[PDB]
Amino acid sequence: DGVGSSSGNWHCDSTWLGDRVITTSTRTWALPTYNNHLYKQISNGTSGGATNDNTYFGYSTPWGYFDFNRFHCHFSPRDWQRLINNNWGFRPKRLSFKLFNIQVKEVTQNEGTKTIANNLTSTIQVFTDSEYQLPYVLGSAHQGCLPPFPADVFMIPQYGYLTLNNGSQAVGRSSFYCLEYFPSQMLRTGNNFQFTYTFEDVPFHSSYAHSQSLDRLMNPLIDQYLYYLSRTQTTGGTANTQTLGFSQGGPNTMANQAKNWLPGPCYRQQRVSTTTGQNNNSNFAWTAGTKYHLNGRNSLANPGIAMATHKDDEERFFPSNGILIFGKQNAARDNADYSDVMLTSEEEIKTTNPVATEEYGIVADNLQQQNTAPQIGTVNSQGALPGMVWQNRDVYLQGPIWAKIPHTDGNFHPSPLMGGFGLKHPPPQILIKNTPVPADPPTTFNQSKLNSFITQYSTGQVSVEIEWELQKENSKRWNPEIQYTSNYYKSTSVDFAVNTEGVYSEPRPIGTRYLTRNL
Amino acid sequence: AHSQSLDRLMNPLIDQYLYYLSRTQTTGGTANTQTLGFSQGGPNTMANQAKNWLPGPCYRQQRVSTTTGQNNNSNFAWTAGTKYHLNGRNSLANPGIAMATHKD
Amino acid sequence: LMGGFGLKHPPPQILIKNTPVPADPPTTFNQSKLNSFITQYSTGQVSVEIEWELQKENSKRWNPEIQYTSNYYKSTSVDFAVNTEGVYSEPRPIGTRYLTRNL
């Protein structure tokens, strides 16, 4: 461990081993000093235009953190293609993390002439929240993960967290956490850090689409032996009175046939078209948004439970806040135009899950009688019902991987709604910070805490290796399957490559469901 | 007791990389027509941010105050009571599923 | 065709690069990739050793063969040497076919 010796090598690669695939990626990072080495109470109340739905109380810390919860941090576009075109499923098994070739630099500023030099004796601090004692901030789709392109140098995100609040105030139960109250490893240039983690057992992600629908699982050539009420009134001429007629479901009455299952749960969303002219002329994104109510404040159920984005021949429609939306390279942060973002589609699950913008079904609303016509009610919100089967939201090359399952007495189908793997004990948070280096202190004692520090930042490389277990496809389907493919004809540039400017970009979102499977 | 709420599990300092429909109509002047605008959830729009979970189940109950003067002047304990229907007879869902007694 | 040995698995390409060293980053997080780096270059030595197998001549030719030779008479400078300026230069192309062999 010396000043003149590399403390790690560049490991970036992928290797396929039949039923496993191991991804390894390394990136160069930079870490500034955050908050001037201070912890600060942050808050947002109801004053000004601030609405109650956005209030909060918490703290910003001097620490940064590593995040690689994004599939493109591990899979290259080509690897993702290898994965999705040939496997019915996959999931994480274990990972390795390493920090090395650390460099702490100090920057001097005098007469606009700025100079940067090495501070060979400075240290950075690193530690993992192995016992999950800090607010788990990963799994909220935040920016700051390792870049998709290996050659890109990235800046490390600052760590902050929230606790209970009443307006802009804290309450008795509000918690304050100090990260320096954890043991942490201190490294100088020449030292390195690393750890291993094993994923808990979790279901394989379904990287397939059903080639059968719930309502079409019968034999199209045979009648049922079961009968259904088919007639309530006589038909001949005008002397029409009540009667009772029963028939057997068959090939031409599949909608009436007795079945064993029901489509998945439903919470509805308002429909919007990509052809603006077909939309109501008003600003309803929030007012007509599908939300949930929690302790006085409202939140968008975004993207909410998994539902088919649209039905047959309606690709132009989507749930106002029921799909994942990624921006194109350089899309604005606010009010970006439709042509600057990329909408995903969960159309593959029309097969078992209700369409996001329609009713779940119809139920009786009264008791019909000789003098009262039967009335029906539309169900727009439907919770778990015995017999339901459903699919979860798909995952994307540039989407999240896992999320921590909240520590609660109960939960139902703990699959993260944004997509991914729900884990009770997810990869630990890796916090990093530059140790404060005091500038010269006063020459006579003073009780006050020092607030004059040498300006500095650090840089180094980081490696993450993950082993994924694959579930091979076993189909007896005779005809070719749908596959993700690169465009065939000429183009100005190559998709998933760099600019003439050197800017890498991801042209479209790439899902995971190409191969098919029966129900 | 939890010292964090479901709707406040994110990092209050970073934006999401995920977008949400933020505008359905133009704003400038009076020539207001339909459009499509998208934004990234952030520290000041936590209510719009994409999240992974949902609050627990709900069966509702009528609210009553310990300050009698704020209550409707009628005897509604049973008539306005939250109940379940089982084979022709009704029972109070008492206390029923677990829900917070009141808000802030 | 330009001459030489055709190999299915030739000496591998040896790629080298200076690792980017970021200059001080902004003090508040920003998603953009860093584009401000400390200016630098590297230097060092490189060694290459190659073992060549020779095929000796076995001629029964009685008379002397043609040979590559240095010029005999005086000259302003030495061929395949340096200038008065210190510039090395290769005066002519030197082939490989001097000894002879029957068909």
Q: Which two tokens stand for residue C100?
A: 């002879």
* Residue A92, helix vs strand vs coil: strand
- C37 contacts in chain A (CB < 8 Å): 153
- Classify strands A421-423 and A402-404 as parallel, antiparallel or unpaired: parallel
Q: Is A165 left (phi over 0), alpha (psi -120 to 50) or beta?
A: beta
Say if CB B32 and CB B39 are below 8 A apart. Answer: no
Residue of A nearest to B50 (CA): A302
Which chains lie within 8 Å of chain B at 3 or more CB pairs, if any? A, C
φ and ψ of B86, to 5 deg: -135, 110
- B18 contacts in chain C (CB < 8 Å): none
- B13 contacts in chain C (CB < 8 Å): 29
Q: Match 């998945």 to its residue by tokens.
A: A264
Q: Which two tokens stand for residue A99?
A: 């920090």
CA–CA dist A279, A316 (Å, integer): 11
Annotated binding site of A for AMP: 415, 422
- Classify strands A227-233 and A430-434 as parallel, antiparallel or unpaired: unpaired
Residue of C nearest to A101 (CA): C19
The domains of chain A are located at 1-519
C33/A154 touch (CB, cutoff 8 Å), yes or no = yes
Q: Which two tokens stand for residue A301?
A: 């159920």
Task: Single out the residue of B45, C56, C20 nearest to residue A51, CA to CA.
Answer: B45
Range A1-519: architecture per CATH:
Beta Complex (2.170)
- C29 contacts in chain B (CB < 8 Å): 13-14
Q: How far is CA A450 from CA A38, A62, A440, C27, in A?
A: 11, 15, 10, 20
CA–CA dist A33, A21 (Å, integer): 37
CA–CA min distance C31, chain B (Å): 9
Q: Which residues sit opposite B20 in a β-bridge?
A: B39
Q: C91 exposed, middle or buried (CB, 10 Å; 0-12, 13-18, 19+)?
A: exposed
- C28 contacts in chain A (CB < 8 Å): 34, 158
Say if CB A126 and CB A432 are below 8 A apart. Answer: yes
Residue of A nearest to B2 (CA): A173
CA–CA dist A350, A368 (Å, integer): 33
CA–CA dist A27, A76 (Å, integer): 14
Say if CB A191 and CB A6 are below 8 A apart. Answer: no
- Most B CBs within 10 A among C27, C30, C31, C33, hence the mutation to make, goes to C31
Cis, peptide link before residue B95, omega less than 30° from 0: yes
Q: Which residues sit opposite A358 in a β-bridge?
A: none
C31/B15 touch (CB, cutoff 8 Å), yes or no = yes
Task: Single out the residue of A156, A125, A132 nearest to residue A29, CA to CA.
Answer: A156
Say if CB A68 and CB A12 are below 8 A apart. Answer: no
Q: Which two tokens stand for residue A411?
A: 């939960």
Which residues, numbered 29 to 58 in chain C, qualify as contacts with chain B under a Cβ-Cβ cut-off of 8 Å?
A: 29, 31
DSSP A255-280: TTS--S-BPPPEE---EEESSGGGS-
Task: Single out the residue of A65, A39, A40 nearest to residue A129, CA to CA.
Answer: A65
Q: Which of A28, A116, A155 sits opposite C20 (nearest CB)?
A: A28
Say if CB A186 and CB A63 are below 8 A apart. Answer: no
- A&B contacts, CB < 8 Å: 213
Residue partners of A512: CB distance under 8 A and separation at least 6: A83, A84, A205, A207, A394, A395, A396
Task: Single out the residue of A184, A60, A35 nearest to residue A124, CA to CA.
Answer: A184
Q: Which residues sit opposite A388 in a β-bridge?
A: A262
A144/C29 touch (CB, cutoff 8 Å), yes or no = yes
Q: How far is CA C71 from CA A94, B26, C65, C83, C91, in A?
A: 72, 88, 17, 18, 12
**Identity of residue A221:** L
Which chains lie within 8 Å of chain A at 3 or more CB pairs, if any? B, C
Say if CB A341 and CB A383 are below 8 A apart. Answer: no
Q: Which letter does DSSP use for residue A221 in this model?
A: T
Q: What resolution does the deposited structure have, in angstroms? A: 2.7
The number of angstroms, rounded, from the C-alpha of A377 to the middle of its chain's C-alpha atoms is 35
A457-474: b (≥16 Cβ within 10 Å) or e: bbbbbbbbbbbbbbbebe
Q: Which of A158, A173, A422 sits opposite B3 (nearest CB)?
A: A173
DSSP A160-216: EEEE--BTTB--TT-----GGGS--EEE-TT--EEEEEEPPP-PPEE-SEESS-GGG
Annotated binding site of C: 6
Q: Which residues sit opposite A13 in a β-bridge?
A: A24
A28/C38 touch (CB, cutoff 8 Å), yes or no = no
Q: Which two tokens stand for residue A143?
A: 């920016």
CA–CA min distance C32, chain B (Å): 12
- C23 contacts in chain A (CB < 8 Å): 116
CA–CA min distance C20, chain B (Å): 26
Length of chain A: 519
Q: Which two tokens stand for residue C25?
A: 């980053």
* Residue C8, helix vs strand vs coil: coil
**CA trace torsion A106, A110, A113, A119 (10° rounding):** -10
B17/A143 touch (CB, cutoff 8 Å), yes or no = yes
CA–CA min distance A43, chain C (Å): 17
CA–CA dist A356, C59 (Å, integer): 90
Residue partners of C7: CB distance under 8 A and separation at least 6: none
Q: Which of A137, A279, A284 sits opposite B11 (nearest CB)?
A: A137
C31/B13 touch (CB, cutoff 8 Å), yes or no = no
Q: Which residues sit opposite A21 in a β-bridge?
A: A16, A468
CA–CA dist C45, C36 (Å, integer): 29
State which H helix or E strand residue A318 sits in.
Answer: strand A317-319
Q: Up-side HSE of residue C30: CA atoms within 13 Å toward CB? A: 10
Q: Which two tokens stand for residue B40?
A: 């990234």
